[PDB]
Write a protein that binds this ligand. Structure first.
Ligand SMILES: CC(C)(COP(=O)(O)OP(=O)(O)OC[C@H]1O[C@@H](n2cnc3c(N)ncnc32)[C@H](O)[C@@H]1OP(=O)(O)O)[C@@H](O)C(=O)NCCC(=O)NCCS
Ligand SMILES: CC(C)(COP(=O)(O)OP(=O)(O)OC[C@H]1O[C@@H](n2cnc3c(N)ncnc32)[C@H](O)[C@@H]1OP(=O)(O)O)[C@@H](O)C(=O)NCCC(=O)NCCS
Ligand SMILES: CC(=O)N[C@@H]1C[C@H](O)[C@@H](CN)O[C@@H]1O[C@H]1[C@H](O)[C@@H](O[C@H]2O[C@H](CO)[C@@H](O)[C@H](N)[C@H]2O)[C@H](N)C[C@@H]1N
Ligand SMILES: CC(=O)N[C@@H]1C[C@H](O)[C@@H](CN)O[C@@H]1O[C@H]1[C@H](O)[C@@H](O[C@H]2O[C@H](CO)[C@@H](O)[C@H](N)[C@H]2O)[C@H](N)C[C@@H]1N
Lengths: 177, 176
């Protein structure tokens, strides 16, 4: 009974972007900042609808990272949310199945930063904890992303990505992961 | 009778992706590498068609850069091409008008790397030579992108200082 649509940010209306913001604010219970919203704009949105009402969302952002010394094209997962009264029905799983398809068609590696509880959902669609060190840019130089190690997860089904290598992410505002 | 379509890489049929490869190889007369092709995948494609034949293309890739110390979200233009026999009919201009729309809706700044004899097209839809320093990552440290200074152009729908420094994100091949 839930319909799924994949739309680029450039294909959304202002009202649809606003409904997305509203869904994220309500679904994260105050844990979602203006920088977090910036992070979810510019790539592909997978949106779940009950009739015309938006009830679920995940976005896939293109990021450009280094894996040890090697450049790697990343599909970075942002702003995963399902409206509270619609949870535990499998919507989040369906959103990730669509997310995996987009990543497989476009990028060398999927990455996301998960809450300690939220890891089971991603693990159930094949994602694994990233085992290597994580780095981010601060004032133009790389530092260790100590707080994120153990929480970042990756995916590339049937690929040859070394999950024990270091990742060096690209720069943004707010949380870099 | 040229039709324009905007399609994410994830929405391209396999037929469209192969047609795109051929169009780029034929249109750039040998100066388009496998890294250049990797660079045009992962974002939005604006494609021009004569009936069912692909005859023009431009892609807009999301990149994450620094403007001086400030993080900025960039729409980066890649793989601009029109099949030779279709050129000088305004297709490239229309591709760029569509590109400007996509950038205005998604990103803080448009950037591209133009050839010395190929800046007039972008200038005619509002783009300007970037006047500040350009930097790229090598060995995980930023170095100057001297080659590109005077060739990279930017566009803001806007309050952006074109004399500020740009620090791009990492990739294979040409960083710009
Ligand atoms: C995380 C989130 C998006 C999951 O959305 P969801 O639609 O509830 O995800 P699913 O329903 O596919 O699976 C969720 C759980 O319900 C369970 N479930 C799904 N369908 C079920 C059913 N018919 N009967 C019983 N349990 C079911 C799944 O097994 C899973 O259990 P697990 O937590 O042990 O894996 C949602 O809780 C949310 O929006 N949280 C707030 C924002 C947030 O934390 N986002 C993620 C940041 S990492
Ligand atoms: C650059 C390129 C994409 C332009 O495609 P195009 O469709 O020819 O672009 P337009 O036709 O809109 O404009 C092209 C020229 O014709 C002129 N023109 C525009 N409309 C015209 C018309 N209706 N009749 C005649 N001339 C016209 C433009 O002013 C421009 O003149 P300039 O060469 O002095 O800028 C094409 O030359 C190409 O594919 N080159 C090879 C790949 C390449 O170099 N890409 C860009 C790298 S920066
Ligand atoms: C896949 C996804 O949708 N991800 C969302 C994006 C959203 O924009 C953001 C809103 N805030 O939340 C998630 O991403 C956060 C992570 O939640 C956060 O993790 C901390 O918070 C968790 C829950 O409190 C703790 O479990 C965890 N140990 C702790 O490190 C990371 N540090 C940064 C990362 N951007
Ligand atoms: C907007 C656009 O579609 N851009 C294409 C992308 C394409 O993937 C690539 C294929 N190769 O070409 C263009 O982008 C190149 C630039 O052409 C190149 O410019 C050098 O080559 C020019 C022509 O010889 C010289 O004029 C110029 N001085 C010289 O620096 C830059 N260094 C790197 C940059 N990725």
């Amino acid at each position: 009974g839930i319909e799924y649509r994949s739309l680029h940010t450039s294909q959304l209306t202002l009202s649809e972007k606003e409904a997305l913001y509203d869904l994220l604010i309500e679904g994260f219970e105050g844990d979602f900042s203006h920088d977090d919203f910036a992070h979810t704009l510019g790539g592909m949105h997978v949106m779940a609808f009950d009739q015309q009402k938006l009830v679920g969302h995940v976005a896939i952002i293109q990021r450009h990272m280094a894996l040890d010394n090697t450049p790697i094209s990343v599909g970075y997962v942002e702003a995963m949310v399902v409206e509270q009264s619609y949870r535990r029905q499998g919507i989040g799983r369906q959103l990730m199945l669509q997310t995996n398809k987009i990543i497989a068609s476009c990028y060398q590696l999927g990455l996301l930063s998960a809450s300690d509880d939220g890891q089971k959902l991603y693990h159930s669609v094949g994602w694994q904890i990233w085992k290597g060190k994580l780095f981010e840019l601060k004032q133009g130089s790389y530092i260790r992303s100590i707080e994120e190690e153990g929480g970042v997860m990756g995916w590339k089904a049937d690929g040859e990505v070394d999950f024990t290598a270091s990742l060096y992410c690209d720069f943004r505002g707010g949380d870099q992961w």
